[PDB]
Structure formats: structure tokens, C-alpha cells
Design a binder for this molecule. Structure first.
Ligand SMILES: Nc1ncnc2c1ncn2[C@@H]1O[C@H](COP(=O)(O)OP(=O)(O)OP(=O)(O)O)[C@@H](O)[C@H]1O
Ligand SMILES: Nc1ncnc2c1ncn2[C@@H]1O[C@H](COP(=O)(O)OP(=O)(O)OP(=O)(O)O)[C@@H](O)[C@H]1O
Ligand SMILES: [Mg+2]
Ligand SMILES: [Mg+2]
Lengths: 485, 47, 376
């Protein structure tokens, strides 16, 4: 049989097709799923990334500081914690199904608070004030396909591996028809909810409609970017089912960020270390060296980050970058390689904060060649005369030619005109483009300085500035030649 | 209503030549049958 | 404890406690009139139920099939009252894969036996032809086809309806759909008013021994959750939040309902929390958006430099410092930054500034400061 095409790279999962609704004779024949071995969850890759170390690696004084400020390793989230814990505890205790909506900007401690609520609920269930529950965590951005959530949650409930439609009907039958005394409470965290939004909103409606079912015993904690995500991207059914009591995670104030950073650096700030002067390795309790990071530097970093975002990740990274800058200067001045008072100062914090604020666009255009600068200058002249914000490339060609032939008494132009139009050579004819014309055009397109229209006619194709005009002029005002003309 | 639909199949009920009687209804049935057979023997001979 | 039981009754998933809802007697009687007319005379007809979300359509119909009712064959009592055997099923449509498969979903809901492929309504018609059958199509708005011309989009649904208008077929269609998202007989479920919501709340916690709410608090919550798009789910959430606020701060009165409505729901205070550099940027952003209204951050920064040079008020700042203040005003809520594609000769994705603040309160806050009045 001769095949019209071949699919020779098919990788099919071993997932079954029969849903949960057809594996028992009736509703009254379903056994107690709590007393089942595969149901409700009743790591093999960790050995593969281990090797033998044959060098004693030198950890300086700032190494413990930089390891301390990592996001992987709650003074300011106590009302959000109380609200989420009260709602989840009341839904677990009363065998109720509910939705808890949480939204906020990045890094304001939403996932951390939800996980701490879940850990405290598990601690409460361990000592038997609430019935036992299953915890499922589904991130919408960690799914290859959005329907994989259907494959994930059911696999966490029954231990079976099914396809997504069969998993969806299995979850529907489990939430609607299975009695509450026969099942267990399930708390599901939906993280990055905007990634679970499809064109038809099947998954959103299903997940928030299962919470309206009597027998479901399902608690859905939905974590999102904004308050008005259902009112913008979801229908009125899903917006009605999510509810009206929505939990805001506002950005941190500077006191809260300062308290977070001080609670990180609680045991190592204003402390003493044993440091070997020949190598630089530091041991917490040969010179006794006193480590401090100043509270004024942390304070103003907290004030700047809190004014910008309120992001705890940004504040921790600014402090870690300041520690990295101080450690780089320390290892430079002490001659320390890789195998009395050390202070992370305020100037390091201000160097860390300004490094993402300095703009390399003007610095990049300042160090370009003369022909790229001449291109930019001629484009600025065309934008000055005809005022279009989009100039044809042939107009730029004729404006470059005009600027060369008018300032023909300028000494630099007299020295460089043969370079632009003959590459400094006899036996090379007078060219219609300058030397490195498409080179600087593609260079400015690669940098994102310009936008070029997709046309095959080189003259009437238009080119637009992608950056602001005053920084381009500023960069043109630094040069000694283009200032004169 | 099948008239409000796109395509519908119907099966007519049932309780034989299309040639009619000429001469204002005075022509016999044997002349009609003969004219049918003569038309078919010329038609098949041509085709 | 009484608070946990009250919150359990006030969830969206609570049990509905002869067989009519407390504030839905007229629609219940109309639905039973439809069922008595169609079932006794064995007629083919089609019902279509309209309503806003949370008006009790699913609750009342689930009450009807729970109380008053080849699989799915049930015994039904007529107004005359001999008996009747009728196959009534209730198919939700989001669980369908394809909208064209509903006939198969109609078929599989009734049989055990043989299994025949249904890909049109004709196979359904010849399956139901030698025999009545009621299908309740909930969320039937999913059955419209996306990206299909008006005609082909309505395509399957009228095939659902015209077979409900055919002679000698035993087919009854009850189609419950949401109005906000979008001939058969139409029943509409009007959104509830304050007295109906009061009656629902008192009847629904009539099981509880002690009423923890005050009556005027319930009436205030019902009045605030009323008007156009009156949702009973919103009222249940408001009462549950009132209980949550009370036991977090520790009967329930008016002040806790107001605490909910202030906790879970302004441009004068946002401007007042800014310094003179950030107010200057917000003035030049809005002025640049009058002239263009499709203007990037670089074009908004382009306007701000020209406004400084004719005024010489404050030191002119860099482009990345400008985008940081725009990020500060993003955090404050005065600016809403999006990334959309420009629509010129060259089409790429650009970042552009949008403002949605109240313009009446913007001019009041800026005219008090004398140096900002050139920038309006
Ligand atoms: N209250 C807090 N106390 C201490 N550290 C915190 C706090 N909030 C946030 N952090 C730190 O910030 C990191 C990021 O927080 P988290 O992952 O919870 O953010 P998020 O609000 O869910 O943001 P995103 O929307 O990007 O997912 C945490 O891993 C932790 O290191
Ligand atoms: N009249 C009523 N009396 C008591 N409870 C009611 C009444 N109407 C609705 N409910 C309850 O309100 C909630 C929403 O009801 P239901 O699902 O029937 O609404 P709906 O009209 O189908 O909304 P949607 O279009 O969003 O599906 C459920 O908890 C239901 O039990
Ligand atoms: Mg997160
Ligand atoms: Mg409904």
C-alpha cells in the first residue's frame, strides 16, 4: 500500500479510553474510593544529576548572603492567609464545594500564601480536627496542552491514566454522581489561570461548574493576574460561578519588603566569620571578620522596589546583585580565585538599581560607524522636512547623496567621499548605494532600531524609527562631524 | 415541514406509454402501440 | 456550630430544601402545563428557556426530574392521572466534544443492545419513529458553531428544533440557555427582586435552629444584589463573606454587609499619592494621547521632551527613567500598559500607553498646582 504521506515520529501515550462512568454497574455499586489502594495517591530521576566533587570550593563571606536571598529559600501576609484558611477550613469541615479567587501582580506572595494555607490545613488534618483531603496543584503554564489539566487531576484522584476527553467525563461523573460519604475532599490550586483560557472556555466552565455540584466536595483556589479577568475574558456564566468575593494581593510596601529582607538576613547580618586570608573561605561561628549589610541601603531598595512594583523577587534580586557587586570588588582587591569589617554598602545598592535603568540605545548608536550614523541622520532630516514618521528608502538614498554633495568642502567629507562611493579605489565604479548600505540597514534592523516594510521594491519600501526621536538626535549630537552639518 | 428543509426523499404510493391518442381522440390504441414501436425501431437504428 | 452550618447552606453547592422553588411557582406551573400538554396528547413540540445566570433554571428543572420523575424510562402522573412511561434525560452540552454529536448523545442517553452510528438527525428520527422522549439540552448555546456564517452557525440547532416540529415523532425538547451569552415556546426566568430573595433566604435557612442574621441586613444585601442581572449566587457570596468577616474580626447587621461591599469592591486618591515628577508625567501622557490616541511609549516620551523645553520645569530625564515612572503609574492604576500590533505600512508589535481614569477628577487635582497648568 502506497502512502500519500508518512508520520514516522508518532509518540502515543499508553492512556485508556473507558471513562469512570462505565466501570461499575450502577451508582449504588461504586465502592468506597477512600478505601482503595490506587485512589488519592496511596521521584525516580533524582540520582541522574549527581557527581563526585574533587575540589574544595571557596565560599566567601558574601556567598551565604547571596544564597540567603534566593527565592527558593510570612510577616506581611496575615489577612490574606486568614481569609483563605478560613474559607478552605470551612469548606473542608462542612463537606462543601467552593471557589476561592486570588489575584495579584507578580511576586506578591500568592503561591507562597496558598501553599502555606495548604500545609497548615494538612497539619490540622494530621491531628484530626478536619477530615482528610487530597491536594492537587495544576499550573496552566506547565501544561503542554490546556486539556492536560483534565489528564492531570483525574490521575491525581484515581491513579488511572486516560485521555483528556475520557478524563473529563470521568471527573464529571465523579463530582456529580458519586456520594459524599463514598469519596474524599479534594483541594485543587489552579495557578496561572489566564493560561487555561481557551477560545470556547470549556475548561474554565467545567472547573468552576464542578464547584456548584452538591456531591463534588471540590475546593478550587484560582490564582490569576487581575481582578477583572472573568469580566474581560470569561462569559457571564463563569463570572457568576467564580463569584463576587475576590481576594486582592496588593504590592508590598517598603516596610514589608524591608521586613522580608531582614527576615532572610536575620542570622547573618552584623555577625562574625572565620576567614582564611590565603584563600577567602568563610565559616560562621585566619581573621575574625564582621559582616554587615546596612539598613539604609536595604531601606531605599525597599522604597524603590515598592514604588515600582512591590515585587519581593525584585527586592531580593536587587539585594543579591548588590552583594554580588561587593563580592566582585572584594575578590578583585584580595586576589581571590575559585576552587576587618565587610559591609554591603549603599553605593552597591544604587549600582544594582541603576544597572537596569541605564539605556544602551544611545551608547549603541554612539559607537556605530559613520555610514550607519549618516543613515540615521538622513532619516532624521527626512522626518524633519516631510513629517511622515515613515520614510521611503530611496528618499534616504537621495538625502544621503544630497548631504554628501552639499557639504563637499567639509574636510572629513572630502577625505571619506571616495570611501563611500568607490571604496577608496580606482577600477571601482561610482556606486548607487554607499559602501555597507545593506550592512548598516540590516544592522539597524537586527538591533530593533528600525522597522522595515515587507516589499521587494527597494526604493519605495518604507522604514520607520522604532525608538524615540530625541535619543536618536542626542546620539547624533554627540558626533563631531554630524554636529557641524 | 419538509418544504422548510434542504433535501428530502419521498416514496410515492402506487395502486403504460406516454403516447397519446390522436385524431381528436378517435385514434385506436393499436395505432398508438404501433407508433410507439415504429418510433423505437427508428430511434434505435439511428443511435 | 451554627456559623459553619449557615455557611454550608450559603454555598453555591448547597442542597435545595410540593416540588416548586420558593420564588419560582409561576414558571414551574408553566413548565408542568407544557409537560401535561405534550405528554398526554403525545405531541411533538419544543420549549426554550431564557434567563440571566443564577435565576434558578437548572435548580428548578433538576427539582422537576428529581421529584416528579430502554433506560431513563420513568412513570409520570397526569392531571387526569392514570400513568405514563416517558424517557426523560438531561444532557449538559459543554461535556460534548462536537456540537454535531448531540444526536448520538441523545441516542446513548436512552438505549442500553445494538449500537448504531448517528451523524445526522435522520438516524435519530428513524430511531425514535417506531415509538415519548424528552431531552433537556442545558447550556445549548455551545451548540452554535464558531467561525461559521450566520446560516451554518445556526445550522445544527434548527435541526434540533425542526425535528421537534415534525408529525408522528415522539420528541419533546426543553432547551435551557443563558440570555447574556446569546417557533418554539419561550419561557423566561426573570432575575429575582429583594422580596423574592428574602423569601428564598429565610426558607432556605428555615432548617437551621437559630437565625444568625438580622432581617434588615438580609434585606439590605438583597437590595444591593438586585436590579438588572440579579444573581442569587452574588447574594449567597455576600452573606458568606459577612459571616467570614464577622468571625475573622472576632448577630450580623448592616455594618458587616457594608464591610463586605467595601472590602470586595477612586482616581482622586491615586493622584494625591504622587510627587511632582510623577504628576508631570501623567499630564504629558494624557496630552500626547489627545493628539494621536494610538501612540507608543517612545512617542509618549517624544511629546514629554518637547513640553519640558518650552517650560524648563524640572530636569529632563532619560527614556528608561520615563518608562519607570510609567511603571509606577502602572502600579498605581492610572496607566494600563498593553502590547498590541501597530496598523501602518510596517506591522510589528509595540508597547503603548492607555489611560482609563476619570477626566473630571484629573483636571481638578492638576489645576491646584500652578506649574502643571502649562501641561493641560
Ligand atoms: N510574604 C513573603 N515573605 C517572604 N518571602 C516572600 C513573601 N512573598 C513573596 N516572597 C518571596 O518572593 C517569591 C515569589 O513569591 P510567589 O511565588 O508567591 O509570587 P506570586 O505572587 O505567586 O507571583 P507570580 O504571579 O509571578 O506567580 C517567593 O518564592 C519568596 O521567596
Ligand atoms: N428559586 C430558588 N430557590 C432556591 N435556590 C435557588 C433558586 N434559584 C436558584 N437557586 C440556587 O441558586 C444557585 C444557582 O441556581 P441555578 O444553577 O439553577 O441557576 P441558573 O439559572 O441555571 O444559572 P446559569 O445560567 O448560570 O446556569 C444554585 O445554588 C441553586 O440551587
Ligand atoms: Mg505564583
Ligand atoms: Mg444552569
Amino acid at each position: 500500500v502506497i502512502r500519500k504521506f508518512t508520520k514516522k515520529n508518532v509518540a502515543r501515550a499508553k492512556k485508556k479510553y473507558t471513562p469512570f462512568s462505565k466501570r461499575f454497574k450502577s451508582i449504588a455499586a461504586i465502592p468506597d474510593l477512600t478505601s482503595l489502594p490506587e485512589f488519592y495517591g496511596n521521584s525516580r530521576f533524582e540520582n541522574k544529576l549527581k557527581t563526585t566533587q574533587k575540589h574544595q570550593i571557596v565560599e566567601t563571606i558574601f556567598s551565604k548572603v547571596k544564597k540567603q536571598l534566593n527565592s527558593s529559600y510570612l510577616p506581611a501576609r496575615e489577612n490574606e492567609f486568614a481569609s483563605i484558611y478560613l474559607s478552605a477550613y470551612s469548606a473542608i469541615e462542612s463537606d462543601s464545594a467552593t471557589t476561592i479567587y486570588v489575584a495579584g501582580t507578580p511576586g506578591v506572595g500568592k503561591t507562597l500564601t496558598v501553599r502555606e494555607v495548604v500545609k497548615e490545613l494538612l497539619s490540622s488534618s494530621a491531628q484530626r480536627e478536619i477530615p482528610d483531603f487530597l491536594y492537587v496543584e495544576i499550573n496552566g503554564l506547565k501544561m503542554v496542552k490546556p486539556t492536560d489539566c483534565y489528564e492531570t487531576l483525574w490521575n491525581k484522584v484515581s491513579g488511572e491514566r486516560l485521555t483528556w476527553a475520557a478524563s473529563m467525563e470521568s471527573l464529571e461523573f465523579y463530582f456529580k454522581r458519586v456520594p459524599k460519604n463514598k469519596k474524599k475532599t479534594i483541594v485543587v490550586l489552579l495557578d496561572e489561570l489566564d493560561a487555561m483560557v481557551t477560545k470556547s472556555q470549556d475548561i474554565m466552565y467545567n472547573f468552576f461548574n464542578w464547584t456548584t455540584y452538591e456531591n463534588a466536595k471540590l475546593i478550587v483556589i484560582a490564582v490569576a493576574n487581575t481582578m477583572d479577568l472573568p469580566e474581560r475574558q470569561l462569559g457571564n456564566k463563569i463570572t457568576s460561578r467564580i463569584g463576587f468575593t475576590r481576594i486582592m494581593f496588593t504590592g508590598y510596601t517598603h516596610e514589608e519588603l524591608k521586613n522580608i529582607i531582614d527576615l532572610r538576613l536575620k542570622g547573618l547580618n552584623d555577625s562574625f566569620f572565620y576567614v582564611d586570608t590565603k584563600t577567602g573561605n568563610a565559616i560562621l561561628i585566619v581573621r575574625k571578620v564582621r559582616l554587615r549589610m546596612s539598613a539604609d541601603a536595604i531601606e531605599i531598595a525597599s522604597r524603590k522596589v515598592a514604588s515600582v512594583s512591590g515585587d519581593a523577587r525584585r527586592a531580593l534580586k536587587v539585594c543579591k546583585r548588590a552583594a554580588e557587586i561587593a563580592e566582585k570588588h572584594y575578590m578583585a582587591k584580595h586576589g581571590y580565585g575559585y576552587d576587618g569589617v565587610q559591609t554591603v554598602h549603599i553605593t552597591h545598592v544604587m549600582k544594582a538599581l541603576n544597572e537596569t535603568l541605564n539605556s544602551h540605545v544611545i551608547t549603541f548608536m554612539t559607537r556605530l560607524s559613520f555610514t550607519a550614523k549618516l543613515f540615521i541622520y538622513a532619516l532624521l532630516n527626512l522626518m524633519k522636512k516631510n513629517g511622515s514618521q515613515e520614510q521611503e528608502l530611496g528618499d534616504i538614498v537621495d538625502e544621503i547623496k544630497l548631504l554628501i554633495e552639499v557639504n563637499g568642502s567639509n574636510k572629513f567629507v572630502m577625505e571619506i567621499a571616495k570611501t563611500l562611493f568607490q571604496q577608496g579605489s580606482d577600477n571601482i565604479s561610482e556606486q548607487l548605494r554607499i559602501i555597507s548600505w545593506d550592512f548598516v540597514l540590516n544592522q539597524l534592523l537586527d538591533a530593533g532600531i528600525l522597522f522595515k516594510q515587507t516589499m521587494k521594491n527597494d526604493r519605495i519600501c518604507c522604514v520607520k524609527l522604532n525608538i524615540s526621536v530625541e535619543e536618536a538626535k542626542r546620539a547624533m549630537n554627540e558626533d563631531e562631524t554630524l554636529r557641524n552639518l | 415541514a419538509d418544504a422548510q428543509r434542504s433535501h428530502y426523499t419521498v416514496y410515492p404510493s402506487l395502486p403504460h406509454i406516454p403516447f397519446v391518442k390522436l385524431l381528436s381522440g378517435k385514434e385506436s390504441e393499436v395505432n398508438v402501440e404501433k407508433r410507439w414501436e415504429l418510433y423505437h425501431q427508428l430511434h434505435s437504428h439511428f443511435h | 456550630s451554627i456559623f459553619l452550618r449557615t455557611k454550608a447552606l450559603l454555598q453555591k453547592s448547597s442542597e435545595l430544601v410540593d416540588g416548586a422553588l420558593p420564588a419560582r411557582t409561576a414558571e414551574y406551573e408553566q413548565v408542568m402545563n407544557f409537560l401535561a400538554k405534550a405528554i398526554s396528547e403525545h405531541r411533538s413540540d419544543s420549549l426554550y428557556i431564557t434567563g440571566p445566570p443564577g435565576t434558578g433554571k437548572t435548580a428548578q428543572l433538576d427539582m422537576i426530574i428529581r421529584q416528579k420523575f430502554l433506560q431513563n424510562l420513568s412513570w409520570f402522573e397526569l392531571p387526569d392521572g392514570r400513568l405514563e412511561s416517558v424517557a426523560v434525560t438531561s444532557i449538559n452540552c459543554i461535556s460534548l466534544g462536537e456540537p454535531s454529536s448531540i444526536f448520538q448523545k441523545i441516542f446513548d442517553s436512552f438505549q442500553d443492545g445494538p449500537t448504531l452510528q448517528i451523524k445526522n438527525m435522520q438516524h435519530l428520527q428513524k430511531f425514535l419513529e417506531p415509538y415519548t422522549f424528552v431531552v433537556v439540552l442545558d447550556e445549548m448555546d455551545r451548540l452554535l458553531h464558531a467561525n461559521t456564517s450566520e446560516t451554518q452557525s445556526v445550522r445544527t440547532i434548527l435541526e434540533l428544533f425542526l425535528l421537534a416540529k415534525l408529525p408522528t415523532v415522539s420528541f419533546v425538547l426543553i432547551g435551557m440557555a443563558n440570555s447574556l451569552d446569546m417557533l418554539p415556546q419561550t419561557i423566561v426566568f426573570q432575575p429575582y427582586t429583594a422580596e423574592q430573595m428574602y423569601e428564598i433566604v429565610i426558607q432556605k435557612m428555615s432548617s437551621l435552629p437559630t437565625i444568625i442574621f438580622q432581617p434588615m441586613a438580609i434585606k439590605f444585601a438583597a437590595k444591593k444584589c438586585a436590579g438588572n442581572t440579579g444573581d442569587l449566587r452574588k447574594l449567597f457570596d455576600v452573606l458568606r463573606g459577612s459571616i467570614e468577616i464577622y468571625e475573622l474580626e472576632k448577630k450580623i447587621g448592616l455594618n458587616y454587609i457594608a464591610k463586605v461591599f467595601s472590602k470586595f469592591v477612586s482616581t482622586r486618591t491615586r493622584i494625591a499619592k504622587l510627587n511632582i515628577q510623577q504628576k508631570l508625567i501623567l499630564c504629558t501622557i494624557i496630552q500626547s494621547l489627545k493628539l494621536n490616541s494610538d501612540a507608543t511609549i517612545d512617542e509618549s516620551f517624544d511629546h514629554y521632551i518637547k513640553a519640558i523645553t518650552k517650560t524648563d520645569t524640572l530636569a529632563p530625564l532619560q527614556r528608561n527613567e520615563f518608562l519607570e515612572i510609567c511603571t509606577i503609574l502602572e502600579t498605581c492604576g492610572l496607566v494600563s500598559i498593553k502590547k498590541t500590533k501597530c496598523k501602518g505600512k510596517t506591522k510589528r508589535f509595540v508597547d503603548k500607553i492607555d489611560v482609563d481614569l476619570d477626566m473630571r477628577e484629573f483636571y481638578d487635582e492638576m489645576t491646584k498646582i500652578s506649574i502643571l497648568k502649562p501641561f493641560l
